Each structure stands twice: as C-alpha cells, then as structure tokens.
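Key idea: predict the complex, not the pieces.
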Amino acid sequence: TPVTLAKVIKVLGRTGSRGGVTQVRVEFLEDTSRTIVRNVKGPVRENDILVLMESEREARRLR
Amino acid sequence: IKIRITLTSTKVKQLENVSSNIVKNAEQHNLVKKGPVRLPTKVLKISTRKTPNGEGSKTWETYEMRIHKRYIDLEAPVQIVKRITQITIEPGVDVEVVVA
Amino acid sequence: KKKWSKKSMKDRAQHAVILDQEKYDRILKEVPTYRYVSVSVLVDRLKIGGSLARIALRHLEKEGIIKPISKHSKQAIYTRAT
Amino acid sequence: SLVVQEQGSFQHILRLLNTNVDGNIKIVYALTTIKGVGRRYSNLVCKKADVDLHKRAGELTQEELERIVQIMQNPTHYKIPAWFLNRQNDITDGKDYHTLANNVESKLRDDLERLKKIRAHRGIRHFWGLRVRGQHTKTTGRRRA
Amino acid sequence: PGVSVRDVAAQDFINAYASFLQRQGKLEVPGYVDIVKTSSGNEMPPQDAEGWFYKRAASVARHIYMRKQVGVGKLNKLYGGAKSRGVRPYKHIDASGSINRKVLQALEKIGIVEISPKGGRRISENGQRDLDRIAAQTLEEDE
Amino acid sequence: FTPVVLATPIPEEVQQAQTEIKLFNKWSFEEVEVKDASLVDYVQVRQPIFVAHTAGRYANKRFRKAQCPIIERLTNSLMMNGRNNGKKLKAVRIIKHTLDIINVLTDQNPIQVVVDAITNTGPREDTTRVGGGGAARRQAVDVSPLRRVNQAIALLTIGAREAAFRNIKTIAETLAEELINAAKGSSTSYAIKKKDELERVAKSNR
Amino acid sequence: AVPSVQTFGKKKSATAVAHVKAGKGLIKVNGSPITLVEPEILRFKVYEPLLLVGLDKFSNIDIRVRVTGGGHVSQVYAIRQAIAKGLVAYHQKYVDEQSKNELKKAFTSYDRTLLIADSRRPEPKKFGGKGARSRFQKSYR
RNA sequence: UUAAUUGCGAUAACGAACGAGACCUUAACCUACUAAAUAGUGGUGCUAGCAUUUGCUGGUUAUCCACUUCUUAGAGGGACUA
RNA sequence: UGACGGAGCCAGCGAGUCUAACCUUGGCCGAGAGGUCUUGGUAAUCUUGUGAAACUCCGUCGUGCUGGGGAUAGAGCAUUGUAAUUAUUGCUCUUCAACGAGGAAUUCCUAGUAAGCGCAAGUCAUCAGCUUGCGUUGAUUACGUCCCUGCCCUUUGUACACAC
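Result:
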C-alpha cells in the first residue's frame, strides 16, 4: 500500500452538503515544499498526518 | 423548667429578627442558653397541570412553599417566665412555649 | 402474517453428557497440548457439552497439567503448563 | 476429580406416567415434560426420593424411577405439603388431589363442561372462545381465528 | 494480634462459619428446610438442599455483629430482592418471615444472639467471643 | 526491595506495584509504540492507569477525547447493545479477561497487541454523501487520524459483539480472537473485512 | 492532645471523613482494612494514594475513614479522595512543604480528581420526558 | 459581532418605552462568622470480644468534657472570562 | 455483557393519626400473601441508615422455542369494601403460546447527558405497565451545515388578502 505521509498547515473550512467534509491545505513530510488541498471527514485541527493512499487528486468544494 | 421557644413561618426575614430579639433578650441579664438551632426547611410541593381543561401540550407546574423552623432553648426559673412570656410577635411567625 | 425473518438454528450435534471411557483417554492426551484452554475451547474443538468441561476444567486443575493463570467469574483461563 | 465413567446403563430416553421423558438432561428438569409437573414439584419429588439431584435422566438406576413414580401418583402420603398440589379440594369429593399427564388435560375438560352445563358466565365464554378472566379484547387477542 | 470479624472478607467468613456449623449441627434443623422458597419473589428453592440454613445463620450472625438491633422485617427487607412479576416490571419483595424467625430463634438457642432493649436482637457475649474466634481461624487457614 | 509492613498489612504484590507505574499490575505500558506516525499523539499509551475506570472530563470540548487511555476507550466502546448500558464494572472485567488471553495466546505484551490492531484496522479512505440533487451518488474522501482510531475501535467492538451473539464462546475470547486476528492482519477478522469494504468502495468511487 | 487531622471528600453525593492521627500505619474504612473494598476491581483505584509516591510516608499515620452515600464506585471515589486529602492534611499540620508540595504536586500530576472533587452533579428532570434532555415519543397520524 | 435590534459603529434623525438582558429559586465552593443531644464528631468514665506486648473492633444518655471537618441552616464571601 | 440459587450489598426526593384511626418499629403464628399482641411518631427526632434495584463475588446451567420468555388458563389460600361474578389486588401449585434483533417509514439525544436501574409523591378503602419528582451505574458519537423539515432580518416578484 503506497501511502504518503502529509501534515496539514492550514484548514480552509468545512464543506459538503451536510458539512461532513473539510477542506485543508496539507503538505507532505517526505518530498516537502509541495502543497496540495485535500478533504477530511473526521475532526482535524493542525499537525495531523493523514494517510494519503493516493497523493495526486486536486480537491474542490463538494455538493 | 426547660422553656423552649419554637418558631415556624414562611418569611425568613420576619422569623430572623424574632429570634434575634429573643436571643438579644436572652443575652441580657444572665440567661445562659442554647442558640438558634437551624432545622432543615420543609419544602411543600404540589405539582399540577396548568391547563384547566384537557387540551394543550403537557405543561406542569410546581407551587412550592418553604417552612423555616428554629427553636430557642432557655434555662432559668420563674423569674424569666414573667419576662420571656411577653411575646415579640410579628405577622406571620408564631410561638409555642414548651416547658420540659 | 409476514415476518421478514429466518427461523432455523443449524444442526444440534448433541454429545457426551456423562464422561465415557473412549474419550477419557482422549481428554488426558489432547488438552495438555492447549496453549490456551478454557470452558469454551474444549466445547468447540473437543466437542464437550455443558456440565463436563467444568468438571474437566476442575479435573486437571486439581490433579495436574494446566494451571490457574486466571480462574474467576464466568472465565477459567488456563495455559499449557509444562 | 469428580469424574466417573459409564458402562452402558445410560438410556437416551425414558417413559414415566405414560409420557415421553427425554434423557441427556438433569433429572430435576427432565421430569418437567410430564403434563402437570413443573420445576418446583419435580424438585420436591426428587428431593424426597434421594435421587442425587446432579444426575442425568439416562444415568438413573431403575429402582429410583419407581420411587419417583409412586410419589407422583400419591404425593400426600409421602409428607408432601397439602399446598403443593395443583388440584386442591376437588369439587367431587374434597380430598387434595394431583392430576397427571393424562389427568391434567382430561380433568380440565370436565370442569369447563361442568361450568358450561350450569350456564355460568365462565362456561359460556369458554364455549364462545373469548377471555374468561376479564381482559380487554378491543385491541388484544386478534390472531386467534 | 487484633483480628476480628471486620478483619475478614465476607465470602471466606460465611463459608468458614458454615463449615464450623455443618461439622457439628448443634443449632437446629427445621422440618420445612427443603420446601421453602426464601421469599415470594424468588421463583425456586435454594439449590444447596442439604445446608443453606447454617449458611443463612452464618450471614445473620455476621450481620448481627456489625450492628446493634435488627428485626425480622429488617432481615426480610435485607434478604429480599426484585421480583419478576411477569410482563410487569420488577419490584422489591420482602423475604420469608418464618425462615428468618427460625434462624433468629435458633441463634438464641445456641447462645449467639439474644434479645436487646429498645426492641430487637443483639449479638451474645458468648456469641461475640466464638464469632471473633472464627476470624482468628479463617485468616490462619490461608496462612 | 522495600519490605515496609504497616499496622494493616498489604500483600507484597501490591507493594511490587509501587515500583513501576500502575502497569495494570501485569502488563507493560512502556515498550509499546504505535507503528503508524499518523496515529501518534491520538492513541494515548504514555499515561498509565491501575484501572480503566475513570470519570474523565472528555466530552466537554473537541479534543480531550484524544487525551484518553486507549484501553479505557475499549471498555467504553464495549458498553453498547442496549441492555448492556452502564455496568462499567463488568466492562473492565472482560477487558481484564480478554487482555489475559492476549498474553496466554500470542505471547507478547497485550497492550502492544491492542495498539497495533487499531492501527491496522483504521480505514484510510472513505466515501461520503454528495447526492447534491439527483437521487444518489457517492464520492471518496480521506479519514482523519482521530476518526481512524474511533472507527478502528468501533469495528473491533461490534465485530466481537456480533460474533458473540447466540454463541457458546464468551465475549472475552471473542474479543481476544478479534483483536489477535486483526493484529496480524488476517482476513477472518470482521473489522479487517469491513476496512476492505470501505476502502474498496472509496477506491471504486474515486 | 495527640496529633490528628481531619478532611472530607465527595464524588456525586457521598461523604468520607478521614481522621488521620498519629499511628503505626493503619488504613481502615468503616472498621475494615483497606484491602477489603467491594468492587474488587477498583481496589487498585482506592489503592492509588498508597502507591503514587511510596509507602514510607504512610508508616507513621493511621487513616480512619467513614463513608456514607452514593453507589459502590461513588463510595470508592469518596475513599480515595478522602485519604489523598488526609495525607496532605497530615503534611499540612506537621511536616514540611518539600514533603507536602511534591506530595501535592504529584497527586494532581497523575489525576486532578484526587484532591479536586467532581463538579458535575445530577440535573433536575423536566416535564415531558423521563429525564432532563430526554422527551416522550411524539407522533402524528 | 452577539444565544439575542445584544453591542461597536454608521446615519433625517433625536430622545425613549416593552421584551431580551437585568432579576428570583435551585444545584455546586467556603476547614472564615453565628450556632446546635430533634444533626453529628473527638475525649473522660462504665462495659464486651480478640490478643495480651504496646493495640484493634465494639456497646453505653444523665458518665461527663471539648469541637463544628463532615450533617443542617441564617448573615456573607467567591466568578468578572482574570 | 445471560438466566437461576446463594452472599457482599451502597442512595436521594418526599409523606405520615385527635377526637381520628395514618406511617408503622419490635415480639409471636403462617411456605407465602397475610394475621396477631404491642411500641414510637403531629416529625432532622418514630416509620427509616427507607439495609431499594440495577450492580459485584461464589456456585447451577448451557447455545437447546432450553433452566430464555411468562401470555394463556385450571385449583386453592388471604387482604380492601354494604357489595367483587365480565377473576380489584396479593400469595401457592400446575398449563408453558407467540417472540430467534423486526419491512416500508419514523421518535428522542451533545453531558452526569443518553441509556440501563429502582425509589418517593399525585390519583387511592383496594388496584401502576401512567404521570410528576428523586437518586444509583453511566457509553460511543459532533464543536459543523442548511442537504431534508422549519424559524428571524433584508432585497426582489406577485393576477394572493378567509392571505400557496
């Protein structure tokens, strides 16, 4: 299971039609200086390493 | 002779100064006595429906009333049951003189 | 009417209620190989009913092999004492 | 260790008081199959018979089942309380009785028929099929026909 | 040392006092031991069959030691419990008064519990010494 | 050692418990590390406890539930299914009994087995509702480390609880078997199979 | 006039007073030794104040605690809080701060509930439901 | 911005009123006051059991002494987000 | 994470008789319900430490429409009342039926809260599965949204005004 360890540096805001997902600006610990935005279902504040099964998909507001 | 002054009322302020006046008459002269004993307040509670009819959302009430009971224990011969018997009674509170 | 539910258990393989001989040699030579033994373990693998494991679990605990690591309320945990 | 072997005297099934008594279970509870004997009465019968309560129905010596059987058909003779019987002060004679497997059902029909013949409220409602103890039937007792 | 009935666990002491009541059955044996249900809430008679009377006597005597005065209704309330009234919810039901009465009178016959002023019973002077001697034994049995 | 005997004596085993921190009296909290760096700082194993029965102030705010011992969380999540509401004295009894089986079978530190099991059964990807407007539709998202631990504990508890429904095996061994099998990543685990379902569903709807 | 101190403690509605005087190391609750609890699982929960710091400070004191009210766990939480406050009180009438301040720091460093009582109390029940927040089942049609 | 037309402020509007808030009761804190066999606590006598070696567990209103930590209260303090 | 039988076995709110007959302690009788002779109390004082239950430890049992579950009935024993019959209720034995986690749909809930547990009071001569309160054990799950069901303000449109 090729995963990517990424630590967030800023939370954009909770999104979704029922507010079950959150937009976060997250950077990867390995191969740093590259920053992407990803979705989170559970509670996240900062310095949380989420296991990214796939690291190549740009996130956006969900209906 | 074991005179005890029992006071029951619903108004705390009026019952307080009656005890204060009784205890102030006690600490004058000599009258070694026991101070006010603070019995727990008896809180009546009758819960009733607000609706006089049967129609309406279930909204209950609680009409409560607090009884404050304090007794004053005296110990002296007849030379103060000519003196203590002069009741310092305000509206509300009542006194019951009990000996032995 | 309608239930929308199933009604069946399986197939009750009723077994020993009184300890016999042909399995008395079995137990004495088969449970000393149990790293973990308890009431339910020989109920499943050794296929023993209700009121025989408790006697058998009391059997070896008092007599020999398996030892009281933790015998307590509704759980008698014993090991492969050797 | 309280472990004993078996020689072959175990019988997987019994037949007491003209009814099926399944083995493989304790004697105190294997006698509950008899129509008219419950957990307490079976415990009482086994206690006075000295049949080693922790014994399976199959692993019972035949000399103890007759002693149990005789207590079933005549409990009051064996020091059983008069208040431990299902049929007390029988309407026919008055002696304290105890109906058995076939007597429990048969005697039940006789008293309903006696109630029915006298045209009492309980008898007529029993024939009708409704409740006879005064329960509500407006919302209960539906899936009966 | 200074061991006593309060210096012992409940289960070990009651079994120990039951042990030192079965070996010589001096106290009594009522005629209806095997037919009582201990209450109107309990559904089945006790499964101890042969004993259960000195077991209750052991528990009653130990209960008497830590207290001053009790009554048969007090024992009924203590030894009662919830009753399964069919589909209706559970409810507290007192124990069998005759059973506690026979135990309490039996403890009087041996000389372990006697009547006390202000009503009720109380541990006996011979009762206190033997019950304390039991505690000195059950601790040293495990030692 | 310290053989101090007071006026009221205490067994030497309890005197031994004062050497190291609580230790559940037999099981090392130390030498237990969460393998995944993702679940660090959210699976509390540093703080030791005699028992898993404390009246903590954990639900008042957002993240004090992370500052809760992982063993205690297992007892809390084992307290479900309706009739088994409350009775926390029971819940720690299975936990103690189950934790023992993890020592008798698969002889490592059971606390270590617990922490690696939850890190191996926590979903990494999950789907979410996005129906927006048009009957239904799924869409895959990620799982926070806190939700990974919460989902991992919930899956283990429900799996053993369901597998103990109308079965001779007690909840103690059912919990032990579920945790051991999930610890080594075997397919027979209910929690592992559920993690496969959620990840596959999210992968298909990616 | 023999050395002695007194304290108190509550969990939900229980009370536990520890008359910690100068003795030979006797810890008793309701006349029974400390080793006889009742849940038999929280025995180490009441053993707590005994074992955080060590038994050497407990060798010159006797803690006698009487408890009333609450459930079995509430009684246990009353006992542990009372003896923990009893230990500091004995150190708060005889012994120095270094004995007391690191005693009174370490107790809260593990858990604040040893000295600070639980502030939460049962809330009154409101009409329309079996509890405060809970409400009866409402329906239409 | 706030639970709140609750405030900052803006401003052909100024000054206001009701509601909300404020207020009252209860639940929490007081080892600070007043105290108290109709609540207790400790001590002195009488007395019991175990060990007696130093103690522990108890019973006892006319055996008295001292205290209010726990038990109840009345007057008060504390919380204002510092 | 069970039922049953033994033990340990801890609460809070509240009520209670005068010219009446209430709360009843204690002793005795009865398996039990209950009966009997007395005692204390107009009440922090006596009922009552309401020794409550859920709870825990020993055992019985076993995955079995079975020791789960107690509807349905039969017989007997008592209490309340002038009167109980379409059983008031309580106690004992026996009969042991549906029900194996519940379909479309839907109710309540963010901390001692939910839920499990019993108690007191109200109706009361007797009768709780009800209600009002009290305490006991005590979770998981959010710290957000207007997607669904509704609300407030402003802008906008209206052939609505008993007003979608």
